[PDB]
């Protein structure tokens, strides 16, 4: 059984749609466990300045209490069958998923319905929840990686809702109210933007019939008429520098405006990104890794944690790298990393493009291992794309991209485009924005 035949097997993602709008989508293969969760489409993108941070607060208070399950009794149930309930809230999507045995599927969907529909939002829990977020804000302040990406979003998508952080400024969290959260739930937790998902020992008929008799109460209308629309964002190539010499290392992130979810250019660009690859000081590959920038970094002990990213929102995304090096390496690294991009924009070789395709294939396949990543893929794909992309289609797109395609797409997205650099800590060798934009084009070309 070669690769292609295994890809064909690929149990399907049967998708349905009950009347109110909620679309169920399951993937049953053999496993006795399951990962059932909903994927409400909400986040910092659908949030104005006045209520920026409401979504994080709602996700905080979701598991605290419900009208049906009074208080921590919900936790008592969830731990009774050993389920691991969890929730994550990105800038675009906010999801709740339960990891539990398949036999306990009927109870899990009922628990999800209670959390996502009949949430108390009780005031005292709001007061107690307020302290947790504020402390969480300081913890994320110490999260020397996260603050850099927040700086990236703030300095790239200025003015637009995308610049807003997920947690929210530490002034809205100190002025929020039950009123503000209830509008967030009413205006965002609606059936059309809700993807019930499951993976494992979950019959699709089971998920459908459970959804009809638990989630049909979800409405599709929007209060009087107010429908939160989509506000397209603009990529303002800029620079933010939070110079703080006390910090040992100097996180730096540089990205340009990459494509949206629907744009097929994700497939080539990712390959190009896989060309640059990732490295950590504890890798062990050393000066033998095929990625040129990794080999240079390991040879000269330049960075510690450089890695590329492809953060991609609905209409626009960030495409670039984030490297963590000492104070007297940044000036060098901005030379090499940029020097790599231009190479991909001018002299990409099919020899390395094959390696990039293999790395992308392995990343896609390995990421889709285990029920929870499968459920995450289903919930995210039904929203971003509108359908779960089968691995066979991914294989076809990866087969299409070659050296010419990678060169063309990199030239179309990387070459001569203003970056969105964002520093932190003892960044002083970090070349001025004029220098960074200077590196964005090669005088040989």
């Amino acid at each position: 059984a070669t690769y292609a035949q295994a890809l064909q097997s690929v149990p399907e993602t049967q998708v349905s749609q009950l009347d109110n709008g909620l679309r169920v989508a399951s993937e049953q293969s053999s496993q006795p466990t399951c990962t059932v969760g909903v994927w409400i489409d909400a986040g910092s993108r659908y949030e104005n300045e006045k209520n920026n941070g409401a979504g994080y607060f709602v996700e905080h208070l979701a598991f605290k209490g419900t009208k049906n399950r009074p208080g921590s009794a919900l936790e008592k149930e969830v731990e009774s069958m050993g389920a691991h309930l969890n929730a994550y809230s990105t800038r675009e999507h906010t999801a709740y998923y339960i990891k539990a045995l398949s036999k306990d599927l009927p109870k899990a969907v009922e628990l999800l319905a209670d959390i996502v529909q009949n949430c108390s939002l009780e005031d005292s829990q709001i007061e107690k929840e307020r302290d947790v977020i504020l402390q969480e804000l300081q913890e994320n302040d110490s999260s020397m990686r996260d603050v850099v990406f927040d700086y990236l979003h703030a300095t790239a998508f200025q003015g637009t809702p995308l610049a807003q952080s997920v947690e929210g400024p530490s002034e809205n969290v100190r002025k929020l109210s039950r009123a503000d959260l209830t509008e967030y739930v009413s205006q965002h937790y609606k059936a059309p933007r809700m993807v019930l998902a499951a993976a494992g020992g979950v019959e699709h008929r089971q998920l459908l019939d459970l959804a009809q008799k638990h989630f049909s109460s979800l409405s599709g209308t929007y209060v009087e008429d107010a429908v939160p629309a989509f506000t397209p964002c603009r990529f303002t190539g800029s620079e933010i520098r939070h110079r703080d010499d006390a910090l040992p290392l100097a996180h730096v992130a540089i990205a340009v405006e990459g494509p949206g979810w629907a744009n097929p250019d994700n497939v080539p660009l990712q390959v190009a990104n896989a060309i640059i690859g990732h490295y950590d000081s504890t890798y062990g590959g050393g000066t033998h890794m095929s990625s040129t920038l990794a080999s240079v970094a390991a040879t000269r002990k330049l960075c510690q944690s450089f890695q590329t990213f492809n953060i991609c929102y609905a209409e626009t995304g960030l495409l670039g790298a984030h490297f963590v090096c000492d104070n007297m390496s940044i000036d060098d690294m901005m030379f090499f990393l940029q020097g790599q991009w231009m190479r991909l924009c001018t002299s990409a070789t099919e020899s390395e493009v094959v390696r990039g395709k293999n790395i992308l294939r392995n990343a896609l396949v390995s990421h889709l291992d285990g029920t929870t990543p499968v459920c995450e893929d289903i919930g995210r794909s039904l929203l971003t794309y509108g359908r779960r992309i089968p691995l066979a289609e991914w294989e076809s797109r990866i087969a299409e991209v070659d050296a010419s395609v990678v060169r063309e797409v990199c030239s179309k997205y990387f070459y001569d485009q203003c970056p969105a650099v964002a520093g932190l800590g003892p960044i002083e060798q970090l070349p001025d924005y004029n220098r960074i934009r200077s590196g964005m084009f090669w005088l040989r070309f």
Binding site: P431, D432, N434, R435, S438
Partner: protein
């Protein structure tokens, strides 16, 4: 700040202004800053009316 994208261009602009002044002087009045008496061949028998240096 780094020198290259900055003052290098500003230095070039200053050099252009300097070229402007110099070219005006050369092309519109070459002997404006210079005594005409120098155009008489040096004769060590006649003291000029004035011996002002440059």
């Amino acid at each position: 700040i780094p020198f290259h994208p900055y003052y290098t261009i500003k230095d070039i602009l200053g050099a252009l202004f300097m070229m402007l002044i110099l070219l005006i002087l050369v092309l519109f009045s070459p002997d404006l800053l210079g005594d005409p008496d120098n155009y008489t061949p040096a004769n060590p028998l006649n003291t000029p009316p004035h011996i002002k240096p440059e």
